[PDB]
What we know:
In chain A, 52% of the residues lie in helices and 13% in strands. By secondary structure, the first copy, chain A, is an alpha+beta fold. In chain A, a hairpin with a 2-residue loop joins strand 1 and strand 2. The interface between A and B is medium-sized, with 20 and 19 residues. Chain A: Belongs to the PrsA family.
Amino acid sequence: ASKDIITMKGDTIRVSDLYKEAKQFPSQPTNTLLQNLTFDKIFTKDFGKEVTDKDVSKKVKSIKDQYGSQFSSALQQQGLTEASFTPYMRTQMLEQAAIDHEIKETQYTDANLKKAWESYHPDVTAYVVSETSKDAATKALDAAKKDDAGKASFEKTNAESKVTFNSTSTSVPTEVQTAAFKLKNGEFSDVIESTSSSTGATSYYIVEMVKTSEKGTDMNKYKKELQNVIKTEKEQDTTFVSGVIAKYLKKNNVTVKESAFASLFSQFTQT
Amino acid sequence: SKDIITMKGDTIRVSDLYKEAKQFPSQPTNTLLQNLTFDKIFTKDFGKEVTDKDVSKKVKSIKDQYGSQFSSALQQQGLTEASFTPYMRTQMLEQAAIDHEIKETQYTDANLKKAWESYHPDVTAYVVSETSKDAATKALDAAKKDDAGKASFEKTNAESKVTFNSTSTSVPTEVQTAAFKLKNGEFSDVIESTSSSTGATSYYIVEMVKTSEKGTDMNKYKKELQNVIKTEKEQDTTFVSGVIAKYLKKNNVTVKESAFASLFSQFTQ
């Protein structure tokens, strides 16, 4: 007795196809095995020639080399083996090829460019110094604004804190950025207070502008920069990715024949 | 069309796995195989003792007690009302094997004596709990004052008159110890009991109505002591894991698909 579980254009997932995934990921549930096996097929039909076995094994090695000794425990946290990581990375790379392509061909619309432009600020170079105690930051600032001598001490002492950031920075906090975009070259800021949402600590920043900047009135001057702002946001927007999946599902007429898994792609057929 | 797991007179094939996959799409392949194996090995020896009617009957009696909470009670466990019946079936088949192993090997004289050293039979008495010590002190003085205050205590705390033994979970040890020293009609002092779980301190008052003694014959309370050994062994994870390991080894359970090789490593070591 032979029976199809999922139907799509030019292909179909059978029980044998499921059991093959079950043997490769005994820890993963049936639902996941089906979802991943479906994505693998629909994304291989349009981006397979762009993600060869060499492209996969090459990226896997570059990642293994960065994690180093932690790579083993990094795969356990995900519930994978070094052997099952290659095929897992293959499906993740095929799925990523589809989202990257969709972002590039449809998200850089005038409406999104203007949305990003409303709060955008170009690169500025300046000394951004963090302190734990408020009293410490207050004395360090008074010593820097005292005279040109104390200013050189601040610049020599906090030499590694001289950075280049824009409105998309993750290292420089929003309170600091706002106070910094108001400074003139050579000007110092007040003791900026910033409470971290991740940890929960309260740091005290001091900023000295070196090279400031203005976006101006022409948005087209920073069109490439704004496209990269839209790119980094869409990649992190779970709603957008689920939408990309829903598209390729609808495109290949993916249908669940086994009523037992009816709500298999319910997480995507809502976006 | 290939065999995944082999055992005596039977085998788990891919079709058998896909049938479980459709019943528990959220559970992983490993779990589907383990449960499907236990279901088969325990059904081979205790299936006639736990029929589908025995399962659906107990399931209904539980659904009726939880009432409206039953839905949210199954979510906390990660189950549906439909997947609860077959889950209860495997739990009952596995329990039939543990109960049978306990009955045929754990009611040894050595274990009966171990249970008997701290056993005490049923006693009927008024057990009243209080939050503040001063409240319990006044309630007691009012009861031991005269026969009038004694009737007030018995009328007001009428539903506190209970029957407990040394295996009670509701009456704390400090209270039990002070109660087994009372004679019929006698009141206890304000008993202080500190909970090991929370950390709160209650103040109990006990009035004996019908006391009892275990005596010198342990055989008189044989059934009670067997139930003491039974409730302990069911909760000894080492013993239960041993029971599983036995039925696995007994049916020569073997994983043929090397992909699941270490499937029962957690049970057979």
